[PDB]
Amino acid sequence: GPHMATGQDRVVALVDMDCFFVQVEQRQNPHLRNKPCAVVQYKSWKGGGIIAVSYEARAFGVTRSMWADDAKKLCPDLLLAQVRESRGKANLTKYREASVEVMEIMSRFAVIERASIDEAYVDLTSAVQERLQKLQPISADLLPSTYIEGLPQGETVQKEGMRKQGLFQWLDSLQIDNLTSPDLQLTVGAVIVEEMRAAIERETGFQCSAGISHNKVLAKLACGLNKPNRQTLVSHGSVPQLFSQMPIRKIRSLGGKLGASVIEILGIEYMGELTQFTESQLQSHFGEKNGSWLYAMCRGIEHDPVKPRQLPKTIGCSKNFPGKTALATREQVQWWLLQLAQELEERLTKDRNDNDRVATQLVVSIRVQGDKRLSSLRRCCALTRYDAHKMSHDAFTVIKNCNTSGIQTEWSPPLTMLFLCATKFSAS
DNA sequence: ATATGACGCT
DNA sequence: CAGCGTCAT
Ligand SMILES: Nc1ncnc2c1ncn2[C@H]1C[C@H](O)[C@@H](COP(=O)(O)NP(=O)(O)OP(=O)(O)O)O1
Numbered sequence A: 001g002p003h004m005a006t007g008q009d010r011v012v013a014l015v016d017m018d019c020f021f022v023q024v025e026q027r028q029n030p031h032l033r034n035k036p037c038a039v040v041q042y043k044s045w046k047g048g049g050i051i052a053v054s055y056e057a058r059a060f061g062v063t064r065s066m067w068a069d070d071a072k073k074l075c076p077d078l079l080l081a082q083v084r085e086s087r088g089k090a091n092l093t094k095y096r097e098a099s100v101e102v103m104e105i106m107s108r109f110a111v112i113e114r115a116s117i118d119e120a121y122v123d124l125t126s127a128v129q130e131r132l133q134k135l136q137p138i139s140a141d142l143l144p145s146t147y148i149e150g151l152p153q154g155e156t157v158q159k160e161g162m163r164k165q166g167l168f169q170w171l172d173s174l175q176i177d178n179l180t181s182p183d184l185q186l187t188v189g190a191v192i193v194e195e196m197r198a199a200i201e202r203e204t205g206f207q208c209s210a211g212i213s214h215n216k217v218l219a220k221l222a223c224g225l226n227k228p229n230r231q232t233l234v235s236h237g238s239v240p241q242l243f244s245q246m247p248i249r250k251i252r253s254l255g256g257k258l259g260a261s262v263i264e265i266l267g268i269e270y271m272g273e274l275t276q277f278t279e280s281q282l283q284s285h286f287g288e289k290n291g292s293w294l295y296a297m298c299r300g301i302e303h304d305p306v307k308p309r310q311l312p313k314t315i316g317c318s319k320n321f322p323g324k325t326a327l328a329t330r331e332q333v334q335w336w337l338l339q340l341a342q343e344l345e346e347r348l349t350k351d352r353n354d355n356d357r358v359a360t361q362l363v364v365s366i367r368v369q370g371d372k373r374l375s376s377l378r379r380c381c382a383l384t385r386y387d388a389h390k391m392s393h394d395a396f397t398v399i400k401n402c403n404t405s406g407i408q409t410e411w412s413p414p415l416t417m418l419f420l421c422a423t424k425f426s427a428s
Numbered sequence B: 001a002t003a004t005g006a007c008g009c010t
Numbered sequence C: 001c002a003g004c005g006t007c008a009t
């Protein structure tokens, strides 16, 4: 007990934008605000594929991975915004630039780790220490949008009434005399996150949600508990009851094959049930690293650091050529490699100017018709010049021998995907 | 017919 | 300037 680590050393937050692509389009087009709206890419096939949905539209059952024509059946008044198309492909520049707006604001408060186009982890341990040294009870007024997971226990017919009662129980209990209380550190962390989220909304117009806990996995989980436009504090103490009915697939990194194996091999359904197994038992089934990770995680402990990185490590461009449209001619493959290369060149040139770095490697990936893998083959070559013509020519050079066609003009088996990625950045 | 990113394994 | 698999938004 006296020597058992509790994973309460850090204060970490995960901030995730609410229906991000939609909010970007709603800021731009006021007509879309406060309406059932979705963002779609490529209109010709079934109205386009939905990639983002406003909360108003979710109420009708509209989801991502849904064709717009089908979404309209569920929600006839659904409004749509289209992703920009350039050179025959979706262009996500608007969303990347909006992402930068948000990341730069977050970086003012603390070290952050860009985790996706719309979320970042924040290591608030130091900021909390400074704020505690600076502060004195914490008023509920400092936590206007915060939920305390697990509370209240023991006006509650409405959600805001429930939120306040839980917050009151939490604050009434808080021991502010001790600067080392983990619960107190989380609370101060939540105050700072309120301030961060206020700054994001004020300076960008975008709303977001956040999770505050002692590690990245719990912070991420916490974030989704009360979306949209709210933040949730998950304390170490809230873990046993939270994990008691938490499907294993809900924890980050367990949503795939590993997660399925955990369920199948151990015959369990919830994250908390993992506590019954010894570390060695878990390592035997899932490997040394996964086993140790699972053993600590089911107890609410994780040590993965918030990495000091707010810029992407790679810059890539990709396009699918489904079914009948699979590229079947050499000239066809070269023309598309050129479109991808030109987009990549623009993005790389801007990156070099903004971030004082240059990519030194080019990775080319493709999918062959009949293969359900994300990638069928991957090859690389030196990226010595930011020249689209050289990059597309080099990319063809490295994959051209995959062509099994006896005939020079033709390409077989036809390609269902092209991917160009710039990597191995070096200071410039 | 359904654009990206990180990172682990070998 | 290795190539493939997994998990993610
Ligand atoms: N599978 C995918 N394909 C393409 N784009 C994707 C996508 N998943 C997400 N996006 C893009 C579009 C998304 O807007 C953006 C953020 O991803 P989230 O955070 O997962 N989802 P959102 O922010 O929309 O809603 P909220 O968080 O409130 O639930 O990334």
Ligand SMILES: [Mg+2]
Binding pocket: A016, A017, A018, A019, A020, A118
């Ligand atoms: Mg989001």
Ligand SMILES: [Mg+2]
Binding pocket: A016, A017, A116, A118, A119, C009
């Ligand atoms: Mg997200």
